[PDB]
Amino acid sequence: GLFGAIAGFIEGGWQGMVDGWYGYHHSNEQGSGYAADKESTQKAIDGVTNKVNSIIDKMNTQFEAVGREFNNLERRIENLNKKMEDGFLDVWTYNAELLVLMENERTLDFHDSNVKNLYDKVRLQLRDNAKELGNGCFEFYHKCDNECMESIRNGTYNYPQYSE
Amino acid sequence: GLFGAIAGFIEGGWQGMVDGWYGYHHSNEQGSGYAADKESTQKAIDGVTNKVNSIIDKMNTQFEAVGREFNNLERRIENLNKKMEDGFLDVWTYNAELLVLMENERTLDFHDSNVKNLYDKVRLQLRDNAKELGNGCFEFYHKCDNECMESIRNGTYNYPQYSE
Amino acid sequence: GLFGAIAGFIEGGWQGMVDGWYGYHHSNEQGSGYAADKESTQKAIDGVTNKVNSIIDKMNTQFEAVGREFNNLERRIENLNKKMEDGFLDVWTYNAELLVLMENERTLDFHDSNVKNLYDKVRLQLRDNAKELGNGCFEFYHKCDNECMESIRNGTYNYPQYSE
Amino acid sequence: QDQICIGYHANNSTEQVDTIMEKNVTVTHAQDILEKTHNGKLCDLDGVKPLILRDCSVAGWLLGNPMCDEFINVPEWSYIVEKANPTNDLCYPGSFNDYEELKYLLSRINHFEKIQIIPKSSWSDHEASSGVSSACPYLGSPSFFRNVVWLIKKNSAYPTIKKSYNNTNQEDLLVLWGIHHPNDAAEQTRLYQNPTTYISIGTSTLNQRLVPKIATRSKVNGLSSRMEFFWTILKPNDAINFESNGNFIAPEYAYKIVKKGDSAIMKSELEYGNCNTKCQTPMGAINSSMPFHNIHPLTIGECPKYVKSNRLVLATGLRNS
Amino acid sequence: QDQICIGYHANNSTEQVDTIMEKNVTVTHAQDILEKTHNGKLCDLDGVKPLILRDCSVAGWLLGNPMCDEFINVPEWSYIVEKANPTNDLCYPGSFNDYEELKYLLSRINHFEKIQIIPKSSWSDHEASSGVSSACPYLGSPSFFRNVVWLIKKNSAYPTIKKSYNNTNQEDLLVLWGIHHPNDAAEQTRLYQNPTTYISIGTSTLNQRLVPKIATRSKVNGLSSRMEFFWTILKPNDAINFESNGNFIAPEYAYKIVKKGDSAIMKSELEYGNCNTKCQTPMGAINSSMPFHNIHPLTIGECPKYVKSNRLVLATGLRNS
Amino acid sequence: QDQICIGYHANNSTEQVDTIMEKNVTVTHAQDILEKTHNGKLCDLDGVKPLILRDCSVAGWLLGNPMCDEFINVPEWSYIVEKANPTNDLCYPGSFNDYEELKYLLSRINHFEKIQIIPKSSWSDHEASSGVSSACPYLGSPSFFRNVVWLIKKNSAYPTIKKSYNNTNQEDLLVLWGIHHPNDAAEQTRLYQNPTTYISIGTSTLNQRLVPKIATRSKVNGLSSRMEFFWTILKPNDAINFESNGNFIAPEYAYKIVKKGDSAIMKSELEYGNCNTKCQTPMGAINSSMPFHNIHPLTIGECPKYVKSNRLVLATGLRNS
């Protein structure tokens, strides 16, 4: 966790969640369960899809290798030929491998980011009306019904409420 | 927002602020208004200026293309010539485009970083004496006059004060 | 500080700490002193060691330059030869310099990350039982003995305790 | 009382990927962008079928090795396959001028139309049917290249030849000819009477004059004699003029180039598969949407981009544990 | 009561830029680093003006095409402009040996000084004023190249020439000569009496012997005859020796190379603009501080670095909404 | 009461490194990955010692410049060192055909074994001991190349030579010969009687016929005469056949190639250091574990990867203040 969210303060991942990358599990009186944030999950889809097609597009004219043959007294330009074709094939092979390693890391950190920013979206609503447990969960100083939560997920959450 | 500050928890940007990249808006009894943090804004200027001139410097000897002509029975080395000059022009064109895309992202995230770190500079001063609103603002448990703020911006802020 | 920890909210570094990259200084009744987090410090060792050997491995077949000589009426292919060998040597020299600059930054930010995530590991334990000072330290609402701390560092810390 | 939690996906995928700082890191979803599979077959490229010389080189094909009749008349092709070491090359020993340059032209042609530009019948004052070797056997009997013709003396006489020829087609002609280099002075008179000879050849562009080199050489295919071949490209409306008094292996069939286009000469040991592809390498064909492959750098058709790695996997999901 | 807020800039700029993960992302400040504008003109490069052959090739210039007198005497140049397909090349048909290599030398020279090294007057025992064709017309009348001279027989006699020549300058000479290849034996005697001829030429380095190829060829510019040109570089203090008994197109003017330096041969259809630049491409000149351009890869002068993209914008500010 | 703090390392290292956004940034630990130090010496590469021609070129070595006896017999070598401008090249003026191609072969050989393939004694009907110049002096007395032999007439007679030679070794022979180009007809008869001569040479592959060019040339090393050298590679079990009636500089010693392998021709002014390395450049050797170096692009042995930078430092620790 570069952002410290994923495998950082939240422990594992939610096997149960089969609806998006990130979301919630709630533990209330009408029911329990999982939901996924369209806002953030959809934004991430758009993210990596754009990453992929820009990687593919960045290397779509690359280097073609035509066959030239040389005779017996042309070992110098034949070598020149060989080592230039080889040489290009090598820098393009490097570029692909390098670009991949980098974008992989920056992508993992991207998902991590999305988590910590979701956790902050909720935390920046329930300020007083819940306590930060420490493992990514909020315990309620009130009672929170299914419909209270729908107000939460879509982030319009009613703060006009006491505390103690 | 990779750091979740810009377009994350703060909503928009301050059209009114015409003095630096980041800063403050205050809503007190002697006046209201905007200021910009020399410390952080200046540090960012130094940032991207250095980025630009290192990008320019990293590609200042690149690949020149001299004209060679070949006759009619030299189609093999003429092709060799062509595809090597082309090929270089292509890897250098890739490098420029790639380097730009990456540095653009890492730069946007840089500004975001600077914001969240400013918000933390203030928050790490007003601990008790204000409440985090949620949209990047602090409501005061005391009265804060123009001069109280000058102590804030320059970050020497007097905590020796009650609370309730 | 991109993550705002190193040279951000913590001021300097701990000259006294000679055991790992990151850790603690405690100011209690049986003694005072420094410790370093095996968990995080060791994880960082594994980090940059892997970075180094992947940089070295990514450029281990590169471009060799064989000597070809040309005579007096072969100035065109001699130039072609020269500018291709030069040209490769230039893109590989760029790649090394570029890759280094990038990985240096991403590495500094890596260490910063590790700090802020350590600070969060502790903070997410001492919730009530300490106050955030502002310069990376926690003042205790109780008494914390050497053995209390060993519970802290290894992060199993007993919260079952009052507050006021 | 109630809590509410925030968390991410984990699942049952075993698929590691690599970053700059850590290897073999398991994740949820991962995309593969490297194609590592061919069909081990030589296919048609979009329905137009390759020229696969079998044990023939380009030289035996073009010149007419009598071991090369499979290719007397070759349809439009998409790309050509030559073996590393074709057995049927120059059956009468010698050389073929500017050979790699002509192979380079061939990589830019998809169709020849062989046409007869000087009939074997047209030779009134020389013999044109006794020009045959044991080094070029056709079914046991002494033969020789079909596309050129080895003229020799008749009635103890090689009167000097003047044959002109005007390309009146819309296409360039590939035209081949040669000179015979005897083993000794005795052979030279036995074959062409006149002790001292030449072959001059001119177009708009070509102005050569060849004299044969009589000389003792090691034996190849039984012979110390050599045959040396030359070629040219005749422009539409230009003429080629030949004048010689001996040692002249005259053309008989030439090639119209009726389809220039994108082609390749592939060195491969393989043989005709009986399939169709949009992308061919010399070790087999590729049917893949992948943007990369690591099969072989020489490639023809709509092709993934060659890369030397044996593993490229791109992370889509997140960390799994 | 009081609050205090923290926030960033937004403004009225519409300028999107691209990241690895999102396209067309609007921002506050943005810098452009790609230059996409030329002046469509051929300029002087820092006050020294180009050689623009107009409908001449290098060969017609250097050899003296009588359609090429604009360039009889050419000042120091900064770079040369040749059209794709110059109309005034070799007016008498033939070839120019090692031509692309000489064009390659030219890309490294900025100034020739033509000097007369063998006067047309100096030829006592041959005619040197009747060597002219209709294929090289000057104002309707049969002319010929100015820099070389087509010697022929006088009083039915071409006595063998021995002309030596010693380069006593501080500079290398470019020296050109040629051989004439007749159409037939009749032409050869009409022109030079002796049926069998040669031209030998030696320096410290060059040791050649040329024999003309008499032969029937297609007509070009009216002729089946050919002229073949050769060139050399004379080192300061070395001599060039010529001995011939016919078919010898002798030099008359040579070139001193008095300014080697950095140059280029540009293929362009354009003509002299009347301006000044520090960076020139063949489609126009560039005045720009930008570190990149996408105009054309062949370039001369203090130049932005060529790149194939049509858009490079670097983010300076932050996100705007 | 108690506090507890969290913090990081700082120390007494002064070592800055660079990022994309800031320069000269001091840190705790830093690793250097660029090697910038050589030993200024020419070493053995893993115990096998270089061939350092001193003031000899490859041509003087291979042909036997009598100023080049240091290298009459040269052991297996690891790589070759030639000076920029060796003083002992061709002492009798002329040229060496396909010279850079033969230097290219040499970069792929580690050992020759000189063997005598035609004894100077074996020449019964020509003189083989009077073929010597002042341009090739050995200890003041007129000498000549050792590996070839300049045959001339005997008893006013150069009967035509037919020498055949069959390579019965397991290795390719490098075989050198030449032709002598006289200054005038007088010289040609003085030396070889017959006014009109040739040298034909054939193998399985080579079919040449050389005629000498008599001609006046500038003086080099005192002479206007030239010597022109040719070489070939004899395949195991093939023969080389020579027939000539004058101007023939016959071979006497040839080279077996008994160790092909990886080598290089280094241009360097340096001389034998007396050391050992695993990696050599022409300005000295490198002993380093570093993955990069910036010394010189041409390199032989187990070598760090050349790079043009003068500074590459990789950050290991963190920021220090």
Ligand SMILES: CC(=O)N[C@H]1[C@H]([C@H](O)[C@H](O)CO)O[C@@](O[C@@H]2[C@@H](O)[C@H](O)O[C@H](CO)[C@@H]2O)(C(=O)O)C[C@@H]1O
């Ligand atoms: C056109 C012709 O004369 N054909 C002959 C042929 C030629 O005369 C000869 O190759 C010169 O070009 O000679 C032939 O016969 C013999 C072969 O049967 C054998 O391989 O080698 C023999 C001695 O070297 C001899 O040449 C031939 O090559 O076919 C007979 C043919 O009619």
Ligand SMILES: CC(=O)N[C@H]1[C@H]([C@H](O)[C@H](O)CO)O[C@@](O[C@@H]2[C@@H](O)[C@H](O)O[C@H](CO)[C@@H]2O)(C(=O)O)C[C@@H]1O
């Ligand atoms: C130097 C000389 O003799 N000049 C002749 C010229 C040559 O004799 C000829 O080109 C051989 O090199 O012949 C000239 O005249 C005729 C042309 O007027 C016409 O284009 O073609 C004719 C037949 O082919 C004929 O050659 C010429 O080319 O100018 C007359 C000139 O005096």
Ligand SMILES: CC(=O)N[C@H]1[C@H]([C@H](O)[C@H](O)CO)O[C@@](O[C@@H]2[C@@H](O)[C@H](O)O[C@H](CO)[C@@H]2O)(C(=O)O)C[C@@H]1O
């Ligand atoms: C093999 C032979 O005849 N050697 C002669 C040599 C040749 O005849 C000549 O180089 C033709 O190849 O001529 C020699 O002598 C003179 C030199 O002493 C001097 O440098 O130049 C002289 C005039 O040009 C003359 O050639 C020689 O080069 O050694 C004498 C030698 O026996």
Ligand SMILES: *[C@@H]1O[C@H](CO)[C@@H](O)[C@H](O)[C@H]1NC(C)=O
């Ligand atoms: C060939 O024939 C064409 C058409 O009949 C004619 O105009 C042309 O001049 C001829 N080409 C040559 C070079 O003889």
Ligand SMILES: *[C@@H]1O[C@H](CO)[C@@H](O)[C@H](O)[C@H]1NC(C)=O
């Ligand atoms: C040319 O002239 C110079 C100076 O007069 C003289 O020394 C030199 O030897 C001559 N060059 C040749 C090659 O004849």
Ligand SMILES: *[C@@H]1O[C@H](CO)[C@@H](O)[C@H](O)[C@H]1NC(C)=O
């Ligand atoms: C050379 O000698 C070998 C072995 O004695 C023999 O078989 C071979 O045919 C000869 N090579 C030539 C080309 O004469």
